[PDB]
């Protein structure tokens, strides 16, 4: 264990010396690609080497044939994918891939989207991959509606859903360029399926709080929305019975009451704050500040009384 | 659900003497050699934590100043180490160090300003370097570097503001680029940016503050986003953000302090990401800086914006107004 790490070091060190020497001499050639491939595999965060690779590839593009240049690009794509398999969270590796694809004459974006789906199967929360997928989706011009379809499959097939809900929060406003009530209603139905499927999944509760803010306002509740929110309220109370340590459902009850009728539900709101603090005492200070805010809002409403 | 359980013989006292010893000897090896690509930042982490502990004199000022000068490139930018390439990250670290040492004219300030100005894009964003990677981390590096040099006016500030605000998300947080998911480190960079540029009124402090306080797990430690393990360096990213937006009291101070103390190595000194792991200077800085934000009387008060002793920022007269 301890001895071969000294010999890895000595190799890394000698390879690094060698790269820098070559670079100073202006030797922008395949030997540099050879040497950096040895270092970047274990050490993809060594940024200056990704820069050396780009400098080599740029230079070679000038003095090699179209066919030779195309071969170097396909080799680069392979090298990048092997590097990502070892460390799929390196900023440098993902940026190099983007640099490389952005400068091709005819990139294969459909194959890059599949690469994304493959990495997201392995780690649904890898934000580097989601960001790359966005880049690719833009470059190709994949419509929001297809990306929406992607997200749904991801949310239902297993959990670790924060990143998929986040993407939905950005896609929905693009389909409808503050959401339309009909869209909002379908979204609420999808999310409350989630949080009833897995009540400990934080992600659906965070996204549901957003949805509760993203619509009309309480003085403008439609009958259908009013009815949906009351139904959610009752559903959260049943969950509270089944899961009395669940803090997300208690907070959400308080928020639903606010969305429905702050003054009519004032007593129950106050009771729920007490229960919630006892269930989530690390959030006591936040909860007290939220209750203070809500009480001021209620004073203002009582005083708007003609 | 994902959390650590802290074992009951975990350290529960602050071992400052051990930490200073650990950092003072750190340069004197595998990780050290393999992390040369971040050396300028590593030197920053060491010097800052030493100064928070009142031990900066134990480090080698003169040698560090020569090393910084040799890392300034002809474009004005600073690299992580000699022969590496200039980047905004290391340009920031360098200027932070020289600020700690009141030695800013060791490098060519005019050229640093020109290097930063040059990396701003038409949409207001900053690239990290000439190769074009765009990240709000680099918007923070650019304005923090310029603020410390008295040169914030050198960039297009309104455009830079609009870009950072385009990275605000449904949950109140910030991502690295438009449409990127929220996470603590990015939130720190963007709130830090908004403090420096006087735009904290654009943050929804109650919504973001809530997302941040929900980073605290039953162990007391903080994660950087939903459903991840806690890590002592979130003591910095999360707390500093909470402080900038006036919501530091939304976390349980005592539970966090016990988590942070349990991350210490009682034998070697240093803090690790989680109790029992191997320590490093990165986690050592953020553990100590987190304790300082929590009001630990043996540690100098730390700026939540610049992660340096407040007394340093007082000296240069750059202390952005926070929310409260
Ligand atoms: C001689 C010291 C050797 C230390 C040994 C190596 C450990 C350092 C490497 C730490 C690192 O890169 N960690 C990962 C994630 C992690 C956390 N805990 C354990 N692992 C990482 O990606 N860290 C990023 C996370 C982040 C992302 C976006 C925004 C903020 C934070 C990170 O800490 N980035 C910082 C600091 C940084 C700067 C240059 C580097 O080459 C590496 C890390 C960052 O990019 N910025 C802009 C923060 C600047 C800043 C201002 C004030 C105080 C501290 N930092
Ligand atoms: Ca000294």
From Swiss-Prot, chain A:
GO biological process, any: protein geranylgeranylation
Its EC number(s): 2.5.1.60
Q: Which UniProt keywords apply?
A: Leucine-rich repeat, Phosphoprotein, Prenyltransferase, Repeat, Transferase
Catalytic activity of the protein: geranylgeranyl diphosphate + L-cysteinyl-[protein] = S-geranylgeranyl-L-cysteinyl-[protein] + diphosphate
Q: Does the keyword Transcription apply?
A: no
How might one describe the regulation of this protein's activity? The enzymatic reaction requires the aid of a Rab escort protein (also called component A), such as CHM.
Task: Fill in the subunit field for this protein.
Answer: Heterotrimer composed of RABGGTA, RABGGTB and CHM; within this trimer, RABGGTA and RABGGTB form the catalytic component B, while CHM (component A) mediates peptide substrate binding. The Rab GGTase dimer (RGGT) interacts with CHM (component A) prior to Rab protein binding; the association is stabilized by geranylgeranyl pyrophosphate (GGpp). The CHM:RGGT:Rab complex is destabilized by GGpp. Interacts with non-phosphorylated form of RAB8A; phosphorylation of RAB8A at 'Thr-72' disrupts this interaction.
Which purpose does this protein serve, as stated in its record? Answer: Catalyzes the transfer of a geranylgeranyl moiety from geranylgeranyl diphosphate to both cysteines of Rab proteins with the C-terminal sequence -XXCC, -XCXC and -CCXX, such as RAB1A, RAB3A, RAB5A and RAB7A.
The record's comment on protein family reads: Belongs to the protein prenyltransferase subunit alpha family.
The protein in question is named Geranylgeranyl transferase type-2 subunit alpha
Q: Which residues of the full protein are shown?
A: 17 to 441 of 567
From Swiss-Prot, chain B:
Give the taxonomic lineage as stored in the record.
Eukaryota, Metazoa, Chordata, Craniata, Vertebrata
Protein name (database record): Geranylgeranyl transferase type-2 subunit beta
Q: Where does geranylgeranyl diphosphate bind?
A: 183-185, 234-237
Q: What exactly does this protein do? A: Catalyzes the transfer of a geranylgeranyl moiety from geranylgeranyl diphosphate to both cysteines of Rab proteins with the C-terminal sequence -XXCC, -XCXC and -CCXX, such as RAB1A, RAB3A, RAB5A and RAB7A.
InterPro entries hit by this protein: PGGT1B-like (IPR045089), Prenyltrans (IPR001330), Ptb1 (IPR026873), Terpenoid_cyclase/PrenylTrfase (IPR008930)
Q: How is the cofactor bound?
A: Binds 1 zinc ion per subunit.
Highest taxon in the source lineage: Eukaryota
GO terms for cellular component: Rab-protein geranylgeranyltransferase complex
Q: Record's family?
A: Belongs to the protein prenyltransferase subunit beta family.
One Pfam family from the record? Prenyltrans
- BP term (GO), one: protein geranylgeranylation
Q: How does it assemble?
A: Heterotrimer composed of RABGGTA, RABGGTB and CHM; within this trimer, RABGGTA and RABGGTB form the catalytic component B, while CHM (component A) mediates peptide substrate binding. The Rab GGTase dimer (RGGT) interacts with CHM (component A) prior to Rab protein binding; the association is stabilized by geranylgeranyl pyrophosphate (GGpp). The CHM:RGGT:Rab complex is destabilized by GGpp. Interaction of RABGGTB with prenylated PTP4A2 precludes its association with RABGGTA and inhibits enzyme activity. Interacts with CHODL.
The first-level EC class reads: transferase
Extract the GO molecular function terms from the UniProt entry: isoprenoid binding; Rab geranylgeranyltransferase activity; small GTPase binding; zinc ion binding
């Amino acid at each position: 264990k301890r001895l071969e790490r000294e010999q890895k070091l000595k190799l890394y060190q000698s390879a690094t010396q060698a790269v820098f020497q070559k670079r100073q001499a202006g030797e922008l050639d395949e030997s540099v690609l050879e040497l950096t491939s040895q270092i970047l595999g274990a050490n993809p965060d060594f940024a200056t080497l990704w820069n050396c690779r780009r400098e080599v590839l740029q230079h070679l593009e000038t003095e090699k044939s179209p066919e030779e240049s195309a071969a170097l690009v396909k080799a680069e794509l392979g090298f990048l994918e092997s590097c990502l398999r070892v460390n799929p969270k390196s900023y440098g590796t993902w940026h190099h891939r983007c640099w490389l694809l952005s400068r091709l004459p005819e990139p294969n974006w459909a194959r890059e989207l599949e690469l994304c789906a493959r990495f997201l199967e392995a780690d649904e929360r890898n934000f580097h991959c989601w960001d790359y997928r966005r880049f690719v989706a833009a470059q190709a011009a994949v419509a929001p509606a297809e990306e929406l379809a992607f997200t749904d499959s991801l949310i239902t097939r297993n959990f670790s859903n924060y990143s998929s809900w986040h993407y939905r929060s950005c896609l929905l406003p693009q389909l409808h360029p503050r959401l339309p009530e009909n869209v909002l209603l379908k979204e609420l139905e999808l999310v409350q399926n989630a949080f009833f499927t897995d009540p400990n999944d934080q992600s659906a509760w965070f996204y549901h709080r957003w949805l509760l803010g993203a619509g009309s306002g309480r003085c403008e509740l439609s009958v259908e929305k009013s009815t949906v929110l009351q139904s959610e309220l009752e559903s959260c109370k049943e969950l509270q019975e089944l899961e009395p340590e669940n803090k997300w459902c208690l907070l959400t009850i308080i928020l639903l009451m606010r969305a429905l009728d702050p003054l009519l539900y004032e007593k129950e709101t106050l009771q729920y704050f007490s229960t919630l603090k006892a269930v989530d005492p690390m959030r006591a200070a936040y909860l007290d500040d939220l209750r203070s805010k809500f009480l001021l809002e209620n004073s203002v409403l009582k005083m708007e009384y003609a | 659900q994902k959390d650590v359980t802290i074992k009951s013989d975990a350290p529960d006292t602050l071992l400052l003497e051990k930490h200073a010893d650990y950092i003072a000897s750190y340069g004197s090896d595998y990780e050290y050699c393999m992390s040369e690509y971040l050396r300028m930042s590593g030197v920053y982490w060491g010097l800052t934590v030493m100064d928070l502990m009142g031990q900066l004199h134990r480090m080698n000022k003169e040698e560090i100043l020569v090393f910084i000068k040799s890392c300034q490139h002809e474009c004005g930018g600073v690299s992580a180490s000699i022969g590496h390439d200039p980047h905004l990250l290391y340009t920031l670290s360098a200027v932070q160090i020289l600020t700690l040492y009141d030695s800013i004219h060791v490098i060519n300030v005019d050229k640093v300003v020109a290097y930063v100005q040059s990396l701003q894009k038409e949409d207001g964003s900053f690239a990290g370097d000439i190769w074009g990677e765009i990240d709000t981390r680099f918007s923070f590096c650019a304005v923090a570097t310029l603020a410390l040099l008295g040169k914030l006016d050198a960039i297009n500030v309104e455009k830079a503001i609009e870009f950072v605000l385009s990275c605000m998300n449904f949950d109140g947080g910030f991502g690295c680029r438009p449409g990127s998911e929220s996470h603590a480190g990015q939130i720190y960079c963007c709130t830090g940016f908004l403090a420096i540029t006087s735009q904290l009124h654009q943050v929804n402090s109650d919504l973001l503050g809530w997302w941040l306080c929900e980073r605290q797990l039953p162990s007391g430690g903080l994660n950087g986003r939903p459903e991840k393990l806690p890590d002592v360096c979130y003591s910095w990213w999360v707390l500093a953000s909470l402080k900038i937006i006036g919501r530091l009291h939304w976390i349980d101070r005592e539970k966090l302090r016990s988590f942070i103390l349990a991350c210490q190595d009682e034998e070697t000194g240093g803090f690790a990401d989680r109790p029992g792991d191997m320590v490093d200077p990165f986690h050592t800085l953020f553990g100590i800086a987190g304790l300082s934000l929590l009001g630990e009387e043996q540690i100098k008060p730390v700026s939540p914006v610049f992660c340096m002793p407040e007394e340093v920022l007082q000296r240069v007269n750059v202390q952005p107004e926070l929310v409260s």
